[PDB]
Structures are given as structure tokens and as C-alpha cells.
Coordinates of C-alpha atoms in Angstrom, one line a residue:
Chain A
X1 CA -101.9 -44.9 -86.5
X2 CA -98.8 -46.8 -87.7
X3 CA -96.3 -44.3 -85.6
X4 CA -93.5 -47.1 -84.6
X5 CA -93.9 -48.9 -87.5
X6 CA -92.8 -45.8 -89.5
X7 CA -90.3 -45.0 -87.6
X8 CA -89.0 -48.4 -88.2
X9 CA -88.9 -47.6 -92.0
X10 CA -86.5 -44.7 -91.2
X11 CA -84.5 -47.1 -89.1
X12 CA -84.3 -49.3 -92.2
X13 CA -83.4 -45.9 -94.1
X14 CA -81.2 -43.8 -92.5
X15 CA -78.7 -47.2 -91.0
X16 CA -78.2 -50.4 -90.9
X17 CA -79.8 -51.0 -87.8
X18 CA -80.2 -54.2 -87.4
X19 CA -81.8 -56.3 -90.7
X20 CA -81.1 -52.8 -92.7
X21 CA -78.5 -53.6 -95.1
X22 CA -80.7 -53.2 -98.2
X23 CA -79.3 -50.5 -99.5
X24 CA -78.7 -49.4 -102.8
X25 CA -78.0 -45.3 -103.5
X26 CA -79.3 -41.9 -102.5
X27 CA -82.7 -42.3 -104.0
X28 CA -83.6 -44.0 -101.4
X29 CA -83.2 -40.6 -99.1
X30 CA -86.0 -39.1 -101.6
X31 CA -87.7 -42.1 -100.3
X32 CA -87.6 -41.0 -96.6
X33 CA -88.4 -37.4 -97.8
X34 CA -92.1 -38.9 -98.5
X35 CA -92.0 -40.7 -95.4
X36 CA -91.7 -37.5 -93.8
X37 CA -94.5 -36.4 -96.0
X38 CA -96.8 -39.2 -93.9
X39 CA -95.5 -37.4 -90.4
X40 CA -97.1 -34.3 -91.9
X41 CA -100.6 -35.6 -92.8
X42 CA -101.0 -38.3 -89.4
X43 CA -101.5 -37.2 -85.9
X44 CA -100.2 -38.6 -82.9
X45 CA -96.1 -37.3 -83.5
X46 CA -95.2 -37.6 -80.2
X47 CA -94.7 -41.6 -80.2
X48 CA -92.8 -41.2 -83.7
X49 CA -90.4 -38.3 -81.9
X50 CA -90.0 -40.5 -79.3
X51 CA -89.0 -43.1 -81.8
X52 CA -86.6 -41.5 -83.7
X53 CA -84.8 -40.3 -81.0
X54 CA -84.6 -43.6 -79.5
X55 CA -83.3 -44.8 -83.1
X56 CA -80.9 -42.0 -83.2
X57 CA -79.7 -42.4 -80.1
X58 CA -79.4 -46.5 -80.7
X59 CA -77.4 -45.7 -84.0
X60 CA -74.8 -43.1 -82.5
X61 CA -73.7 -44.9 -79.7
X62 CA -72.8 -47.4 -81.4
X63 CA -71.6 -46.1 -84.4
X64 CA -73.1 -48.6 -86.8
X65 CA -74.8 -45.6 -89.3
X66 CA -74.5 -46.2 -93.2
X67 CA -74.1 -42.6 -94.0
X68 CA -73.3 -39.6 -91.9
X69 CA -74.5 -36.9 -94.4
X70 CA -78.2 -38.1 -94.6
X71 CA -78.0 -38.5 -90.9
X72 CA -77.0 -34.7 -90.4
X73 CA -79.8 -33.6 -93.2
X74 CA -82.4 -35.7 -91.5
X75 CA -82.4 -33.4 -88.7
X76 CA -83.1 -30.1 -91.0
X77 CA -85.7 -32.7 -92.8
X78 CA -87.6 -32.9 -89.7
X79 CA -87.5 -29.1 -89.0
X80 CA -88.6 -28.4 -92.4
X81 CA -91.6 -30.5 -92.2
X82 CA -92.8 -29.5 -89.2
X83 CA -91.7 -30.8 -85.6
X84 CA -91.6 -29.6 -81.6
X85 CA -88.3 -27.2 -81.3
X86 CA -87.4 -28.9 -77.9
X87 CA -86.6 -32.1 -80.2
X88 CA -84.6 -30.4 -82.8
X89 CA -82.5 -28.4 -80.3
X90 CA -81.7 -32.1 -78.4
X91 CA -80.8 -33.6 -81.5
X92 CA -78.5 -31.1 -82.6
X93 CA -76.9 -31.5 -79.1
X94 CA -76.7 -34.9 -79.4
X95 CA -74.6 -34.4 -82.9
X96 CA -72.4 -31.9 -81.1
X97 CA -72.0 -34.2 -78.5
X98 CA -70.8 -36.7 -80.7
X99 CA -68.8 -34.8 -82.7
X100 CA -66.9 -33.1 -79.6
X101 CA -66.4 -37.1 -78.3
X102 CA -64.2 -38.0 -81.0
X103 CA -61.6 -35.0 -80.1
X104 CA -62.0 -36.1 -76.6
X105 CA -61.3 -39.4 -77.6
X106 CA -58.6 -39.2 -79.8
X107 CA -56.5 -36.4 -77.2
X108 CA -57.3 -39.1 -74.4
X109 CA -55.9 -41.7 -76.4
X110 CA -52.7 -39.3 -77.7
X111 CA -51.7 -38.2 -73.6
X112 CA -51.8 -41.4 -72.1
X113 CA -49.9 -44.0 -73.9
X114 CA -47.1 -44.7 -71.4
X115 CA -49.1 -45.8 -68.4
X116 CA -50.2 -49.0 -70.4
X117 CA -53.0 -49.3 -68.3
X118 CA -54.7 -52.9 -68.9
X119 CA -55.0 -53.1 -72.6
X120 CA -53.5 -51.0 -75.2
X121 CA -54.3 -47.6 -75.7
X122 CA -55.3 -48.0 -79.5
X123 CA -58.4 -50.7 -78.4
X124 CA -59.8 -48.3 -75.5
X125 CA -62.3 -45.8 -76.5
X126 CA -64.0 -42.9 -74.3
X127 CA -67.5 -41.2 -75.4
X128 CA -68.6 -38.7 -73.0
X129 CA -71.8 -36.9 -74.0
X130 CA -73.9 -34.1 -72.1
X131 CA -76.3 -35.8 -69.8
X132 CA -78.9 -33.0 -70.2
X133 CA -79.9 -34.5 -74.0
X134 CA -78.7 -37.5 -74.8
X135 CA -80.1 -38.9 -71.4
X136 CA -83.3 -38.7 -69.3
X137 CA -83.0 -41.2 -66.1
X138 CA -80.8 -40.7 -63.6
X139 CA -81.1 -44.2 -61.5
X140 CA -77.4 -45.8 -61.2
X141 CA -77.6 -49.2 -60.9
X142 CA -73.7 -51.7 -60.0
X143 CA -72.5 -54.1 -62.4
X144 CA -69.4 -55.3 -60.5
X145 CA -67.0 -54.5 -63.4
X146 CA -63.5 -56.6 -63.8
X147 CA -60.5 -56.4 -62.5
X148 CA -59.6 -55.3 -66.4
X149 CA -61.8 -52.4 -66.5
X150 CA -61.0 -51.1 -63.1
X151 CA -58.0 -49.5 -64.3
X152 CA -59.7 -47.9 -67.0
X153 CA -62.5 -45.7 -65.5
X154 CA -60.6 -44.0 -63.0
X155 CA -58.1 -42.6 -65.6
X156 CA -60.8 -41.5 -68.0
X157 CA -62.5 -39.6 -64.9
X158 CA -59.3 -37.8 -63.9
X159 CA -58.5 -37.0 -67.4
X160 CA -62.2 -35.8 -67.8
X161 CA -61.2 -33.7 -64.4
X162 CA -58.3 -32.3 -65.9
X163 CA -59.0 -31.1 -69.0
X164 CA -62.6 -29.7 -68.0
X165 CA -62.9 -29.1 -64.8
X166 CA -66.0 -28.4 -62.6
X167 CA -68.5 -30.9 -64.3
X168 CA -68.9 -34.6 -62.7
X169 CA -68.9 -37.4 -65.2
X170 CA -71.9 -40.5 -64.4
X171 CA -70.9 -43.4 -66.0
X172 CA -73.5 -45.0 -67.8
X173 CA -72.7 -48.9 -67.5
X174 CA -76.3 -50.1 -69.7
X175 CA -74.8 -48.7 -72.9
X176 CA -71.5 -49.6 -72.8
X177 CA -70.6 -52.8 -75.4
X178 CA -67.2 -54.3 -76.2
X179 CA -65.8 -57.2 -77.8
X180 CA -64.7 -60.7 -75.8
X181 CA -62.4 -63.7 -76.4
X182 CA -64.2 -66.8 -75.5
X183 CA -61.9 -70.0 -75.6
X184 CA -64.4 -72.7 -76.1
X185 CA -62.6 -76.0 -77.3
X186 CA -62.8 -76.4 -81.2
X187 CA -63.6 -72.5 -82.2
X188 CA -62.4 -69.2 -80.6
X189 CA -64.7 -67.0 -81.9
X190 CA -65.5 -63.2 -80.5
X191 CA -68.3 -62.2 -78.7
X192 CA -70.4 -58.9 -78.4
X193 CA -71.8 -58.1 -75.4
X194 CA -72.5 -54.8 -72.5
X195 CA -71.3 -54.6 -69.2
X196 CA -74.4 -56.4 -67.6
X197 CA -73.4 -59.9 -70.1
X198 CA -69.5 -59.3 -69.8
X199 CA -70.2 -59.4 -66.3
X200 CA -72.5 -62.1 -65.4
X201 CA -70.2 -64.4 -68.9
X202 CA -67.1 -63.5 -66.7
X203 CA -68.7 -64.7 -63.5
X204 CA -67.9 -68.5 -64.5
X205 CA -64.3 -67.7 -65.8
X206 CA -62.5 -68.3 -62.2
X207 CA -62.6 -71.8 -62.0
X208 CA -63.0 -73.5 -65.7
X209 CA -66.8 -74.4 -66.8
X210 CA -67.8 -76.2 -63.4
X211 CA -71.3 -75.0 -62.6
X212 CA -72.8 -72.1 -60.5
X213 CA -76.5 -71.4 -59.2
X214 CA -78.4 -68.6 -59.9
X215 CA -78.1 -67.1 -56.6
X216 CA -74.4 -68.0 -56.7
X217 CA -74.5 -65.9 -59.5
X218 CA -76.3 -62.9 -58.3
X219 CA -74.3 -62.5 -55.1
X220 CA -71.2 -62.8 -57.7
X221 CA -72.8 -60.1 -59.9
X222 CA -74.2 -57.8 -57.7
X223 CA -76.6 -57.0 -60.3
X224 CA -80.0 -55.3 -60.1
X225 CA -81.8 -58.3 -59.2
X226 CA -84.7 -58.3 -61.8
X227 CA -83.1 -57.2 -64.3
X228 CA -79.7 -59.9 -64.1
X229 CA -82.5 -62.3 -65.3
X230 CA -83.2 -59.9 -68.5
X231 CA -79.3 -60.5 -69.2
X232 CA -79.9 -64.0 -68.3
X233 CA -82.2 -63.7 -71.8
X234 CA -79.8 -62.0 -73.5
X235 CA -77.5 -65.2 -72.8
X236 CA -80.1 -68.3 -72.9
X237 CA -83.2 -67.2 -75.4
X238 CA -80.6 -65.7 -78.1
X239 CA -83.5 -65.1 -81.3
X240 CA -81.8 -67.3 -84.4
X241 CA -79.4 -68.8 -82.7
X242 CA -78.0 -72.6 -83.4
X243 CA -76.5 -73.1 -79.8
X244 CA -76.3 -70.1 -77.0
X245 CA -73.0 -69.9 -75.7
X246 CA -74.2 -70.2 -71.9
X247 CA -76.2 -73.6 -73.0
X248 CA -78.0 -74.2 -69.6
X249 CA -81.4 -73.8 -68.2
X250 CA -81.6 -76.8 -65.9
X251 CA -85.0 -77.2 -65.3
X252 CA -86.1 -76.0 -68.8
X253 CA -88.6 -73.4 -68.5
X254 CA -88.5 -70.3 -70.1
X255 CA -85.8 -67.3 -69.9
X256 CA -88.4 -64.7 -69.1
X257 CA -89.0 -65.3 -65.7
X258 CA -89.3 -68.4 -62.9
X259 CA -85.6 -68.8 -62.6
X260 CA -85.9 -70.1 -59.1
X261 CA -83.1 -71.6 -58.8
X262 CA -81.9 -73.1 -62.0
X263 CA -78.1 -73.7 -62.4
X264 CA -76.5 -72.2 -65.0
X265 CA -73.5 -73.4 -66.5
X266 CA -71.3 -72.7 -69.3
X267 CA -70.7 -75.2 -72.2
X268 CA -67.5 -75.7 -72.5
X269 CA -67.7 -77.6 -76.3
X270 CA -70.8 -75.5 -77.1
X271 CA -71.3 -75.7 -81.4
X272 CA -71.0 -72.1 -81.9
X273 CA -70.0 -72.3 -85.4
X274 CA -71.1 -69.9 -88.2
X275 CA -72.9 -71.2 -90.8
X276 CA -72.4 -74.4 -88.4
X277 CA -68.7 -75.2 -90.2
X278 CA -65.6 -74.4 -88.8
X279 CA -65.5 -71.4 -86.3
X280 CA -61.7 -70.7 -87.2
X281 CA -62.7 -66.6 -86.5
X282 CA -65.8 -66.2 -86.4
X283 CA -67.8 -63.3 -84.7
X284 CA -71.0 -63.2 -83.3
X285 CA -72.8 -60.0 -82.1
X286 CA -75.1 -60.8 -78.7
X287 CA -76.0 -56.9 -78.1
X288 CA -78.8 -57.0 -80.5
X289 CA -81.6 -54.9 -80.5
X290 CA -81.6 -53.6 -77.1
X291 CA -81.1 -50.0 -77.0
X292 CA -81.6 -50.0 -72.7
X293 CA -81.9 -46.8 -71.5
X294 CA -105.5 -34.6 -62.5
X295 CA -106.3 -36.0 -66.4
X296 CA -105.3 -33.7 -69.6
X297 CA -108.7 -32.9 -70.4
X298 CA -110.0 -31.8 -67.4
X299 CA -106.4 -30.5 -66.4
X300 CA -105.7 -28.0 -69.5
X301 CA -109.0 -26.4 -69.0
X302 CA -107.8 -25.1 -66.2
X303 CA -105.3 -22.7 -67.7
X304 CA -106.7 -20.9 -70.2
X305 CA -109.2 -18.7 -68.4
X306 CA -105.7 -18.0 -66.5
X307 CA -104.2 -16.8 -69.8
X308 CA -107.5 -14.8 -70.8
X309 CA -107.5 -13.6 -66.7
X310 CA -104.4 -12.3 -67.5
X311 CA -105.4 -10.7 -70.9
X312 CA -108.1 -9.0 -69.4
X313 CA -106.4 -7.6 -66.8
X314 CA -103.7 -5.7 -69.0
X315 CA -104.1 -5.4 -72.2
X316 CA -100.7 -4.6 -73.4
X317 CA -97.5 -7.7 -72.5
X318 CA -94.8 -9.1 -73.6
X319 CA -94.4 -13.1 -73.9
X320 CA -92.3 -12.9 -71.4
X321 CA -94.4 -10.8 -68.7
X322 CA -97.1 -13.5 -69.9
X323 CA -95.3 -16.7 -68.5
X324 CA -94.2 -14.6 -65.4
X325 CA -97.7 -14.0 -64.5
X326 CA -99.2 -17.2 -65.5
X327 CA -96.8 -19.2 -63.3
X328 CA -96.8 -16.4 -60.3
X329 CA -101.0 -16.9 -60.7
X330 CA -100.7 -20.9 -61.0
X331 CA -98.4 -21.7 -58.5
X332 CA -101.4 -23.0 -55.8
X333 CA -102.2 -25.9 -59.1
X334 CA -99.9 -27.8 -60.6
X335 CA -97.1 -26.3 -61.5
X336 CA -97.1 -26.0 -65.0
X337 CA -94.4 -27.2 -67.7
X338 CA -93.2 -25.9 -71.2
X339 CA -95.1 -27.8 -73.9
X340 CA -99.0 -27.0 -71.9
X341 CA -98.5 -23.2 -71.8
X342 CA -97.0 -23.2 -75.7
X343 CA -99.7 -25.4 -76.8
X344 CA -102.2 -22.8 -74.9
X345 CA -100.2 -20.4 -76.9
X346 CA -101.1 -21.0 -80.3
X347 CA -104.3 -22.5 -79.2
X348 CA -105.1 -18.8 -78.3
X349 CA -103.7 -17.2 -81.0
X350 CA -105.3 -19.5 -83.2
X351 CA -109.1 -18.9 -82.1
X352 CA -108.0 -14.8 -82.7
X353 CA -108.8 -13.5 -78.9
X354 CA -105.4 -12.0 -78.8
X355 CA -103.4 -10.1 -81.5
X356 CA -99.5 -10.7 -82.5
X357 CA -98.1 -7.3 -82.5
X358 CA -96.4 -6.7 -86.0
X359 CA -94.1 -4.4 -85.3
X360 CA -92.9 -6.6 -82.3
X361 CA -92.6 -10.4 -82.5
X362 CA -93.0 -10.9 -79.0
X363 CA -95.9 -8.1 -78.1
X364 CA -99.2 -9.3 -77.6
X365 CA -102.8 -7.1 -78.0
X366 CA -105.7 -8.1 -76.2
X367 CA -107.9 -9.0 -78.9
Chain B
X1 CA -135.2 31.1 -37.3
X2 CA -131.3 30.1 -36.8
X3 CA -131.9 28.2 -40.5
X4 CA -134.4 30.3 -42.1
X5 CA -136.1 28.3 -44.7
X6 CA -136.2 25.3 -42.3
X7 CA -138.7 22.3 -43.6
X8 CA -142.0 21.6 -42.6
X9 CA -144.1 20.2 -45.8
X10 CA -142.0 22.6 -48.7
X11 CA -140.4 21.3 -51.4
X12 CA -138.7 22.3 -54.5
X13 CA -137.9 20.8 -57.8
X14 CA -135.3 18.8 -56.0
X15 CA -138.2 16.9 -54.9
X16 CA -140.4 17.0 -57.9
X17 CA -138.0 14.7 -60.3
X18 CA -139.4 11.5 -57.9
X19 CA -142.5 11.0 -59.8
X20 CA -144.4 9.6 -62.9
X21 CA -146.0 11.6 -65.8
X22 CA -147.1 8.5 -67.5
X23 CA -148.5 11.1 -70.6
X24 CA -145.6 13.0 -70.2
X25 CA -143.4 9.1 -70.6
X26 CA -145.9 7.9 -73.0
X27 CA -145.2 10.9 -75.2
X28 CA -141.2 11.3 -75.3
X29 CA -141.3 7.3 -75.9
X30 CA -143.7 7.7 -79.4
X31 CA -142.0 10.3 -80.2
X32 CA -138.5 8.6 -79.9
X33 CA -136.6 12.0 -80.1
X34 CA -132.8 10.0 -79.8
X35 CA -133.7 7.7 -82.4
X36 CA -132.7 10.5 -85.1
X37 CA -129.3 11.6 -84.0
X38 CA -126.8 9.7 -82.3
X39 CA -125.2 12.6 -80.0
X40 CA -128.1 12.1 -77.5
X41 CA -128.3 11.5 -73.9
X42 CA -124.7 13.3 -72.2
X43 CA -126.3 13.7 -68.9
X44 CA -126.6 10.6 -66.4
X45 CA -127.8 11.2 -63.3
X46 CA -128.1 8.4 -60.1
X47 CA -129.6 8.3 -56.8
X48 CA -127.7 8.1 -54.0
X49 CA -129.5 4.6 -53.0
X50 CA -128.4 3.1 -55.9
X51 CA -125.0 4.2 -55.5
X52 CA -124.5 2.7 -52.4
X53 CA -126.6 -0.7 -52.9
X54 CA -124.1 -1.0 -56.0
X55 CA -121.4 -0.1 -53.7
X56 CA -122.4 -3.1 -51.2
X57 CA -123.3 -5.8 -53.8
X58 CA -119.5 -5.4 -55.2
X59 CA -118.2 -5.6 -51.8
X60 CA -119.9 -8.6 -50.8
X61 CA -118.8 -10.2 -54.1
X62 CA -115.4 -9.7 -53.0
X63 CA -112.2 -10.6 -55.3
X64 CA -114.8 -12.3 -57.6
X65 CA -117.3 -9.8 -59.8
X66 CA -120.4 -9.6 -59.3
X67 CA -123.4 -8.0 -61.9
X68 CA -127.0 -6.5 -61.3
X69 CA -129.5 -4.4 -62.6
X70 CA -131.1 -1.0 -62.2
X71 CA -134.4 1.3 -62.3
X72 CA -135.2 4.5 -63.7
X73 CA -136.7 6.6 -66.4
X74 CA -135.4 8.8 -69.1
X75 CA -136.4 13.0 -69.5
X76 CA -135.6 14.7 -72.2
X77 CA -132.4 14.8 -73.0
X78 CA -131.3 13.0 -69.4
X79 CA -131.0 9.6 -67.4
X80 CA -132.6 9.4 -64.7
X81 CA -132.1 6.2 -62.4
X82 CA -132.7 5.7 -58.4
X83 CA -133.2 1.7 -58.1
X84 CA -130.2 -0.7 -58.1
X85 CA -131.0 -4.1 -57.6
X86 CA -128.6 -7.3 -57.7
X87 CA -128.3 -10.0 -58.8
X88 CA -127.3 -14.1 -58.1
X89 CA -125.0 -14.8 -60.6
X90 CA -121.4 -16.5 -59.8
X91 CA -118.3 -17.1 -61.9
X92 CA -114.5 -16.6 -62.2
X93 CA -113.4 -12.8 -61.0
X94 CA -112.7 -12.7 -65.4
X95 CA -116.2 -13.9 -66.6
X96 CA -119.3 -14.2 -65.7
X97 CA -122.4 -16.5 -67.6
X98 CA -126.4 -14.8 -66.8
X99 CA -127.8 -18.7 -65.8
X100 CA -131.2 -19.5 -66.0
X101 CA -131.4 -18.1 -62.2
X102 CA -131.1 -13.9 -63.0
X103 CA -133.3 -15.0 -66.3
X104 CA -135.9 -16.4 -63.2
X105 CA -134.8 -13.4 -60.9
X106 CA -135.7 -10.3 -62.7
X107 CA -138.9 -10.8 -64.2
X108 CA -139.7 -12.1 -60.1
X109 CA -138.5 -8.8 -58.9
X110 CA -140.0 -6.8 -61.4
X111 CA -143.2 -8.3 -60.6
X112 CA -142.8 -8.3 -56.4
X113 CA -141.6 -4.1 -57.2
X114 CA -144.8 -3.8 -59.3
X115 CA -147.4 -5.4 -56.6
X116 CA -144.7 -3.0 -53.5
X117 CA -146.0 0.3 -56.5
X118 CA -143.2 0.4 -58.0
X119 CA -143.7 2.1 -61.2
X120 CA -140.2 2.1 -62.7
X121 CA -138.8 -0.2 -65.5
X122 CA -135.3 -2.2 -66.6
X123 CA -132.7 0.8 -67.4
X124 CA -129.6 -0.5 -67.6
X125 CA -127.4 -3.0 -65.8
X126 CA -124.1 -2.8 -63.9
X127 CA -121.2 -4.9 -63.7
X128 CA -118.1 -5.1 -61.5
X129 CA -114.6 -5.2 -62.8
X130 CA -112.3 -6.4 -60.1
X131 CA -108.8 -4.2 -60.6
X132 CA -109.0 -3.8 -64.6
X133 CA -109.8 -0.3 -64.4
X134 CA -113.3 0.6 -65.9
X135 CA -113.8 -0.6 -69.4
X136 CA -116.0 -2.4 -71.9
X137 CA -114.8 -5.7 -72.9
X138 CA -115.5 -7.2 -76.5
X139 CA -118.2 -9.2 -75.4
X140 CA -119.8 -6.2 -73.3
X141 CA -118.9 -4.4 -76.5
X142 CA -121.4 -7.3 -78.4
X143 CA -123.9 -7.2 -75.3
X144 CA -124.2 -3.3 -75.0
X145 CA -124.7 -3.3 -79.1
X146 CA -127.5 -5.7 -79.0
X147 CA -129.2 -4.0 -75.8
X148 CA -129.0 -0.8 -77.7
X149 CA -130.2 -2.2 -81.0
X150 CA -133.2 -4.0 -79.5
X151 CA -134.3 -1.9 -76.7
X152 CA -133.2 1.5 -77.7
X153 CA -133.2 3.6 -74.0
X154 CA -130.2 1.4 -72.1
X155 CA -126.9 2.4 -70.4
X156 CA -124.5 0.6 -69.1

């Protein structure tokens, strides 16, 4: 099924993504409301969850949605028309979150403003969300940060420690973005980038344009090896771009891979000009559209004889006495997870050979 | 002397209910006494033999369950059964599926009991519940109704 592509439409609904600034009024909501029809009658939701979530999480870290209200109604919307719980319950985490960041944010900035730091307090901004939901890996990975940003971390981490004290705080370096000053001959004009481009554009900075090789510039980085030369595309294969600010390759090629040793070099009267005249103050934005972040058949037969086992043994349980025994009995298998035994759940109580009490929610009759 | 009575040939009707009145059997079977009122048969009663060839067979099946059948005739208003006989059917301690094998196995026994002169026909059957007490499930609820409804003297 379309799945993605559907979810794209929301992404084109519910923000301004990327190419999503056709937006005229609120009808356009109702609009989504059929889309949400569509998640109803296909199959397959798991792809479009993970989607939207991904969306979601793209659009609120970077705080680029249209509206805020349809945003908060989208995730009733979703509930409404039928979705897993576990999804619902991150998302309204995820909004917490968010909304608990900005008072975090705003009492950081209020405290310390007589330390100075590096750069004032009104252009730094903290965001620290719950790791459990808004975030799955747990690989760190250095970036080298500069000097100007050294300053910054540690007093956001003792701050962190003083005000709520007993949790540690994991920076996350891959969704960080801010705004740079580049100083290229005719036209100073501001660039977007993460930590990973700041980085490896800062890299060349200590001694003029000059030119540096590509092992040069991952000793200088310290990056993740493989993936420096993913920021290398992010800074060389720019999509609708009339000159890349780091205008090098050497030996041509392409940026997705075969770097070798190809020596990279910024250009110093690069024609980065919006609508190619005059780049008095212009901006360009190079984050883009990255958002970085036993077979089921034969293995779900295996449980529920367990369940039935169970069942048959005692006829009266309680859910909870249920998923006690079932993970006491399959311990020696795989051990089992949250969505298998729920889906087993209603597949069980769909096919009628158990009984929901009514009396008690939770009570279960053997058949 | 010291015992009395003693036993050299006598007998009593202790003795006399291990036979076969085959007019007396082809009577109460035509004249299908229980098939008028349902409050008949109340009295059950097993040979030791059986008793402990059950016992055995359930023990050898071990955790799992096991499931055989048994021989024996009806009088009057009682059961009587002295045969068990087993079966070779496997499965899960929760369920187990009659294959093609007991299907193969019974009629063969029956037949090998018939040429030994064994007289005695298909009873019943007994099954072995591994902890969960000693009740009929809903598909031995389904089973005993269709063995009841089709071939009328049965017990389970």
C-alpha cells in the first residue's frame, strides 16, 4: 500500500515541512480527517506510525510547525480512528516534553545571564526531552565541538543537575542545528547547518581557505568515519543548489561514496547568491530534509496453545495472573514482548474460546 | 479348617459377573431400556486390571496426557468394564489429535482380542488430565455428545 506516501500528505498538512507552504485555512484539517479515514480502511499501519512519528518528531525539534492547535488535535484524531496505545501514550510524552522544555528554557536563560558565557544568553537555547519516548538508540557517537560551544554544555548539564537532580542528561549531537556567519568575499550570507557540518565547515577556518585532504579532515573531525562522508553530501551534492559553499571534489566523482582521498577545499569567492543577485543578507538553510536519528509465522504459533494451556488449567484469572503465567511458562523460548501477547489477546477473544467477564473488565472465563 | 470356607473349585456370584449371556445381551440391547428415560445408568463398576493398566499408561505418559480405550458390557441398570487398553497417540500435555494411527490401532486390537476369545466390545474411552483436576472440556463436552448420540451405551 501507499503507507509513506500518505504520511507525506500529513507532512504537507499538519507543517510546513519542507515544500509545505501551500496553505490556505482550516478546511484543509477536514482534509486530513479523510486521510485518517484511508488509515482506517488500508492495512499495514505500522510503517505509517512509524512515519508520523518520525514527522512529528522532525517538526518539534525544530520548531518549524504552521499551527500548534491541529498538531495537539491530531493526536486525539489518531486515537479516535483507531491506533496502537503504545504510540498515543509516546506522543503525548513527546508534547509534554516539549511543553516542559520551554520553561526549562526560558528559567535557564533568566538565572544565568551574568556569566556571559560565549554568546549571549538571548541566542542560546536548551531543549531537553525524556529519552524514554522521544528517542530509541542509544549509540553516542564525537563530533569534536568548538571552542565556542565548549562553554555552553557544561553549564546547561550543571544547571540540568541543579534543578533536577538524580537523572543524567545524553546529549544528542545528530539533532542539534544552529545558524553560522560565513564571510565569503562579495556576500555574507547565513548558514544552517548540525553539529556534524558546523564541525567539519569549521575544520578549514584556522588558517584562511588553503586546502585540506580528506584524511586531514577526519583526524581534524574525529567524526564517525562513514558517516563524515554523509556530511561530506550534505556540503558537496546540495539538491537545487547554484554553487555549494564547500565547492570542491577534486577528482570529481560522486559524494556518495569513493572519497579516497580527494581534497576538499573551501571557496573562498563561491557565488552563493540568492536568486543569483546580490547576497547583501541572504540565508540559506543546508539542514534539509534529514531528520537523523525464529520467523513471525512459525514464531506466534508457538504461544497460543500457551495461552489456551493456561486457560485450561484454571479456568477462572485475571489479565494480570495471565501474563504472569505466560512469561513464568515461556521463559525457556524467546522471551516474549508487549505487542505479541496483546495481539494473542484479542486474537483469542476474537475467535470466542474465552469470555470477558462483565462484571469485571479485567476477569477472564474459560470459554 | 483355620479359614473355614477355604477354595477348592467354589465360587459365588462374585465370580459369575465374568461371563457372556449373548441372549441375555442380545435382549437388553433390542429392548434399549435407557433409551426412554434419561436418569439411567448411576452404577459404574471397573475391574481392578483396568484400574491399574490405566494407572500405568498415565504414568508412562508422564507430564504429557496420554488417552486409551476400554472393554466391557452393560447389565441392567449397571456398567460393567474389566479391559483397559491404550493407546499411541502424542501431543501437547493441553490437547491431544486421535491420528490416523489409534483409527489403525483399535480396529487391530479388537480384531487380535477377538482371534485371543475375547468377546467383549468398545465401552468407553479414558483420557488423562495432567493437574486440571477431573473435568470435561468443551470439546470432550462435543465428543461425549456425539458418542452418546451415535452409539447410545458409552461412558467416559
Amino acid at each position: 500500500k501507499c503507507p509513506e506516501l500518505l504520511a507525506n500528505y500529513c507532512d504537507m498538512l499538519l507543517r510546513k515541512t519542507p515544500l509545505s507552504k501551500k496553505l490556505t485555512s482550516e478546511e484543509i484539517e477536514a482534509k486530513l480527517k479523510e486521510v485518517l479515514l484511508v488509515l482506517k480502511y488500508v492495512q499495514n499501519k505500522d510503517v505509517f506510525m512509524r512515519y508520523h512519528k518520525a514527522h512529528l518528531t522532525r517538526r518539534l525539534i525544530l520548531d518549524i510547525s504552521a499551527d500548534s492547535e491541529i498538531e495537539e488535535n491530531m493526536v486525539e484524531w489518531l486515537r479516535e480512528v483507531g491506533m496502537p496505545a503504545d504510540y498515543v501514550n509516546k506522543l503525548a510524552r513527546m508534547f509534554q516534553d516539549i511543553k516542559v522544555s520551554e520553561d526549562l528554557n526560558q528559567a535557564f536563560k533568566e538565572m544565568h545571564k551574568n556569566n556571559k558565557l560565549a554568546l549571549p544568553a538571548d541566542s542560546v537555547n536548551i531543549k531537553i526531552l525524556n529519552a524514554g519516548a522521544w528517542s530509541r538508540s542509544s549509540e553516542k557517537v564525537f563530533v569534536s565541538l568548538p571552542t565556542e560551544l565548549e562553554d555552553l554544555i557544561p553549564e546547561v548539564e550543571e544547571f540540568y543537575k541543579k534543578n533536577h537532580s538524580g537523572r543524567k542528561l545524553h546529549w544528542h549531537h545528530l539533532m542539534s542545528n544552529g545558524i553560522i556567519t560565513f564571510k565569503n568575499e562579495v556576500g555574507q550570507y547565513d548558514l544552517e547547518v548540525t553539529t556534524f557540518q558546523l564541525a567539519v565547515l569549521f575544520a578549514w577556518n584556522q588558517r584562511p581557505r588553503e586546502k585540506i585532504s580528506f584524511e586531514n579532515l577526519k583526524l581534524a573531525t574525529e567524526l564517525p568515519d562513514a558517516e563524515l562522508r554523509r556530511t561530506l553530501w550534505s556540503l558537496v551534492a546540495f539538491p537545487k543548489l547554484k554553487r555549494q559553499v564547500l565547492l570542491y571534489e577534486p577528482q570529481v566523482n560522486s559524494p556518495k561514496d569513493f572519497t579516497e582521498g580527494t581534497l576538499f577545499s573551501v571557496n573562498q569567492e563561491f557565488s552563493l547568491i540568492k536568486n543569483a543577485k546580490v547576497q547583501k543578507r541572504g540565508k540559506i538553510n543546508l539542514i534539509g530534509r534529514l531528520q537523523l536519528t525464529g520467523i513471525v509465522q512459525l514464531r506466534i504459533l508457538r504461544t497460543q496453545e500457551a495461552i489456551i494451556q493456561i486457560m485450561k488449567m484454571r479456568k477462572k484469572i485475571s489479565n494480570a495472573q495471565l501474563q504472569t503465567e505466560l512469561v513464568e511458562i515461556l521463559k525457556n523460548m524467546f522471551l516474549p514482548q508487549k505487542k505479541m501477547i496483546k495481539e494473542q489477546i484479542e486474537w483469542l477473544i476474537e475467535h470466542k474460546y474465552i469470555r470477558r467477564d462483565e462484571s469485571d473488565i479485567n476477569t477472564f472465563i474459560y470459554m | 479348617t483355620w479359614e473355614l470356607a477355604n477354595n477348592m473349585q467354589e465360587a459365588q456370584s462374585i465370580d459369575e459377573i465374568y461371563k457372556y449371556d449373548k441372549k441375555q445381551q442380545q435382549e437388553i440391547l433390542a429392548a434399549k431400556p435407557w433409551t426412554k428415560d434419561h436418569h439411567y445408568f448411576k452404577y459404574c463398576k471397573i475391574s481392578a486390571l483396568a484400574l491399574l493398566k490405566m494407572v500405568m499408561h498415565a504414568r508412562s505418559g508422564g507430564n504429557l496426557a496420554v488417552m486409551g480405550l476400554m472393554l466391557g458390557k452393560v447389565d441392567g441398570e449397571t456398567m460393567i468394564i474389566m479391559d483397559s487398553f491404550a493407546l499411541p497417540v502424542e501431543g501437547t500435555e493441553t490437547r491431544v489429535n486421535a491420528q490416523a494411527a489409534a483409527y489403525e490401532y483399535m480396529a487391530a486390537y479388537i480384531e487380535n482380542a477377538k482371534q485371543v476369545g475375547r468377546l467383549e466390545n468398545a465401552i468407553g474411552w479414558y483420557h488423562s488430565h495432567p493437574g486440571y483436576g477431573c473435568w470435561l472440556s468443551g470439546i470432550n463436552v462435543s465428543t461425549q455428545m456425539l458418542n452418546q448420540q451415535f452409539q447410545e451405551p458409552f461412558v467416559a
